[PDB]
C-alpha cells in the first residue's frame, strides 16, 4: 500500500533532519564577530548604452572582459563593445519572446531561447562575413528558462516542463535528461571545473547534479516561495539563492545545510538576479523596487546601494578580471559601473 | 586609427537599419487571446483569417482600414501560468472569450477573470469580453429543462433594467438571462475603482462577420485615451 511508502518517507526525513542537526556547533556570525568591516563602497556610472526598443531580459559577458550580448523583447540580439560604446552585430530573430542568452567561451558562437520551446545556436565568425542560424534544438515541452555552454559542442538547458537536458550539437540529439523536480526550473549555474552544476526550480528547493553520471547527489531546502536566481561561489564549495519572499541565502555543500541569511525589514519585494565578486567578499543583488544592493558575504550587513534605473531590474553581471559590473532593466538601457 | 574608422562605419550602418526597424515597430497593434477548451476561440480565429509539432506559440495577422493587428495564442504549455503571463505587460489588449450556455463552468470563468483583473503586472491593460454561443443559450432557456437558479440563487430576485434595448422579436426571458450574466462580470470589473483600465462587453455567435470592426473601435478608444494622458492634455 501507499501507507507503508509514506511512512518510510517520513522516517527517512526524520533521520535526515537529525543527522543534519548533529553537525551544528557554531553560527557563522559568531566566528566572524572579530572581522574588520569593509566600510563604505561607492561606485559610479561610466557608460550608458542605448538602442533597444523594449524591455531587456538577459545579458552575458565574454572571457576577454570586453564584449557582451543583450536580448530584448522585439526580436533582437546586440553585441556591444564596452570600451567605446560601439556596435559589432545586430541579429533579428524568428520569434520575438526571448528569455535567455549565452556567449560561448571561445568567442565563436551565441545561443538564445524562449516561449517557442527551441534553443537556437548562431555562428559568428564566417567566411562570407554574415551571421546565419546554424542549429535549432527541439524536444522540450515548455518554455526555456536558461542555458549555458560547456565547450563548442555541448550545451545544457532548463525549461518549464520540470526537466533539464544535455545536448550534443552536430547530431542534434539529447544525451542525458535530468528529472526529479516538481515545478518549473528557473536557473542553473555551472561549477568552474565543469564536473557538477546546480539547479533552482521554483518549488522552494535546489538540487546538485552530476553531469557524467546523470543523477542527483543532494537537495537543499529552506526558502518559502519560488527561486529565481542562482550562482556559484568562486572555489566551488558554496552557493547563493534568491526568492520572492525578499530574502537571499547562502548554502554549503559539505555541511549539507544553510549557513547565512540576508534580509531586512524594509524590503517587501522579490529578487531577480544574484552574482558574486572576484574575491568572494561582495554579493550583489537586483530587486523589484528599481534598485540594486551590495552585501558583505561574511557579516550579513548591507554596504551599498545602486539607484540608476527607472523600471524593474532583471540582468546583472560581473567580469572575469573583476573590473566592471553591468546592469540591465525594463526601460531598455544598459549601464556599466566601476 | 585605420581600424577605428571601420568600427565607426559599422556602427553607423547598424544605426540606420535600427531606425528603419523602429518605424515599422511603432505602428503595429498586438493582441493576446485567452479562453478555455469549451470556448470557441478557434472559430473566431478562423473567421478573422479571411480578411509544426510541439510548438509553443501561434501568430495571426490581419488588417482593417489600413491598420495592422498581430494576435497571439498560446499552445503547448503546462497549466501553471503565473510566470509566462509577465511577458505580456505591454500589449494593447487582452481578448477574453467565455462560453455562456454552460451553467456549470461559469464560476471557473468568473474566477479566471477576477485573477486577470487584479494582477500586478497587468493592471494597465484593458479587456475586451466576448460572451459567445448566444444561439445555444436561447434554445436552452426556451426549452425549459434546466434552471439557472440552481447555480446562482440571486437570479430569484432580479428584474430587467428599465432601459433595456433588446433586438425586436425576442422573448423577454432570454433578455433577462443574458443581462444577468453580463452584470456578473461588470460588477467584478468595477470593484477596483481606479479608472486606469476599462472593460468592453459584447455578445457574439458562431455565424458572425462584424468582430473585426468591434476590435477596431475598442482599440481606437484605448489609443485615444492613452494619447490624452501621455501629452498632458487633460
Amino acid at each position, epitope marked *: 500500500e501507499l501507507d507503508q511508502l509514506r511512512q518510510e518517507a517520513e522516517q527517512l526525513k526524520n533521520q535526515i533532519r537529525d543527522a543534519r542537526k548533529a553537525c551544528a556547533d557554531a553560527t557563522l556570525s559568531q566566528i566572524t564577530n572579530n572581522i574588520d568591516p569593509v566600510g563604505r563602497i561607492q561606485m559610479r556610472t561610466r557608460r550608458t548604452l542605448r538602442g533597444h526598443l523594449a524591455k531587456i531580459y538577459a545579458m552575458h559577458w565574454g572571457t576577454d572582459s570586453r564584449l557582451l550580448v543583450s536580448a530584448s523583447q522585439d526580436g533582437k540580439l546586440i553585441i556591444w563593445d564596452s570600451y567605446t560604446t560601439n556596435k559589432v552585430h545586430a541579429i533579428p530573430l524568428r520569434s520575438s519572446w526571448v528569455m535567455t542568452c549565452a556567449y560561448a567561451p571561445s568567442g565563436n558562437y551565441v545561443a538564445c531561447g524562449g516561449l517557442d520551446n527551441i534553443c537556437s545556436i548562431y555562428n559568428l565568425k564566417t567566411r562570407e562575413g554574415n551571421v546565419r542560424v546554424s542549429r535549432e534544438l527541439a524536444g522540450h515541452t515548455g518554455y526555456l528558462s536558461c542555458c549555458r555552454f560547456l565547450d563548442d559542442n555541448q550545451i545544457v538547458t532548463s525549461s518549464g516542463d520540470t526537466t533539464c537536458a544535455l545536448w550534443d550539437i552536430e547530431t542534434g540529439q539529447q544525451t542525458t535528461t535530468f528529472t526529479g523536480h*516538481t*515545478g518549473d526550473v528557473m536557473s542553473l549555474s555551472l561549477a568552474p571545473d565543469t564536473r557538477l552544476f546546480v539547479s533552482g526550480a521554483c*518549488d*522552494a528547493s535546489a538540487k546538485l547534479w552530476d553531469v557524467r553520471e546523470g543523477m542527483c547527489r543532494q537537495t537543499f*531546502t529552506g526558502h*518559502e*516561495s*519560488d527561486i529565481n536566481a542562482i550562482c556559484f561561489f568562486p572555489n566551488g564549495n558554496a552557493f547563493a539563492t534568491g526568492s*520572492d*519572499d525578499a530574502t537571499c541565502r547562502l548554502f554549503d555543500l559539505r555541511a549539507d545545510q544553510e549557513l547565512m541569511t540576508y534580509s531586512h525589514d524594509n524590503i*517587501i519585494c*522579490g529578487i531577480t538576479s544574484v552574482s558574486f565578486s572576484k574575491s568572494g567578499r561582495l554579493l550583489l543583488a537586483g530587486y523589484d523596487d528599481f534598485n540594486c544592493n551590495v552585501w558583505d558575504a561574511l557579516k550579513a550587513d548591507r554596504a551599498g546601494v545602486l539607484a540608476g534605473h527607472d523600471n524593474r531590474v532583471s540582468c546583472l553581471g560581473v567580469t572575469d578580471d573583476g573590473m566592471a559590473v553591468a546592469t540591465g532593466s525594463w526601460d531598455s538601457f544598459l549601464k556599466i559601473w566601476n | 586609427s585605420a581600424e577605428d574608422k571601420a568600427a565607426v562605419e559599422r556602427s553607423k550602418m547598424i544605426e540606420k537599419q535600427l531606425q528603419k526597424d523602429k518605424q515599422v515597430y511603432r505602428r503595429t497593434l498586438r493582441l493576446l487571446l485567452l479562453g478555455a477548451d469549451n470556448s470557441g476561440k478557434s472559430t473566431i480565429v478562423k473567421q478573422m483569417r479571411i480578411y509544426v509539432k510541439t510548438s509553443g506559440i501561434f501568430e495571426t495577422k490581419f488588417q482593417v482600414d489600413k491598420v495592422n493587428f498581430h494576435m497571439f495564442d498560446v499552445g503547448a504549455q*503546462r*497549466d*501553471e*501560468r*503565473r510566470k509566462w503571463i509577465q511577458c505580456f505587460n505591454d500589449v494593447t489588449a487582452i481578448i477574453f472569450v467565455v462560453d455562456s450556455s454552460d451553467y456549470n463552468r461559469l*464560476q*471557473e470563468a468568473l*474566477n479566471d477573470f477576477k*485573477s486577470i483583473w*487584479n*494582477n*500586478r503586472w497587468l493592471r494597465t491593460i484593458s479587456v475586451i469580453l466576448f460572451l459567445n454561443k448566444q444561439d445555444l443559450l436561447a434554445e436552452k432557456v426556451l426549452a425549459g429543462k434546466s434552471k439557472i437558479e440552481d*447555480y*446562482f*440563487p440571486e437570479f430569484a430576485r432580479y428584474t430587467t433594467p428599465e432601459d433595456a434595448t433588446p433586438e425586436p422579436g425576442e422573448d423577454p426571458r432570454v433578455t433577462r438571462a443574458k443581462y444577468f450574466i453580463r452584470k456578473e462580470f461588470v460588477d467584478i470589473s468595477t470593484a477596483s475603482g481606479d479608472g486606469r483600465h476599462i472593460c468592453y462587453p459584447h455578445f457574439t455567435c458562431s455565424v458572425d462577420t462584424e468582430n473585426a470592426r468591434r476590435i477596431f473601435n475598442d482599440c481606437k478608444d484605448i489609443i485615444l485615451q492613452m494619447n490624452l494622458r501621455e501629452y498632458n492634455l487633460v
Partner: nanobody
Amino acid sequence: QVQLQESGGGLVQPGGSLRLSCAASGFTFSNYKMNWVRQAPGKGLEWVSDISQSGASISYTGSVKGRFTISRDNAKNTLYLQMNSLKPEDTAVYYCARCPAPFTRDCFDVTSTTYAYRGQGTQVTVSS
C-alpha cells in the same frame, strides 16, 4: 519545508455538521491568504472558499451560501471550516491551498499538475 496537514472528516448523515481543521508549518502565517478546494468522484478540481490576511475579505461559492463558514487563527497557526446541513452531493476529498506569493491578492491554485503548496486531503462522505 512547507507543510500543511488536515484533520476532520468521515461519514455523516444528511443534515449533519462537521469541522475541518488545518495545521500549517514552515512559513509565516500572517502574510498569506488561504483557500479551501475540493474534488468530487469523477470530476475535476473545484473551488469553495477564500479568506484574506486579517479577515476583512471572505468569499464563498454559490452552492455553499448559507451553509459553510470559514475562520482563521494566526496565533495558533490554524485554518478552520465549518459544515452545516449537508447533502448527498457534497462527498469529496478536501484540500487547503496557499497562494504562491506574499503581500498579493491573486490566486492560481486549482491546477492538477502537482501544485507545490497544498496538503494531501481529507475525505468526507454523506449517506444514510
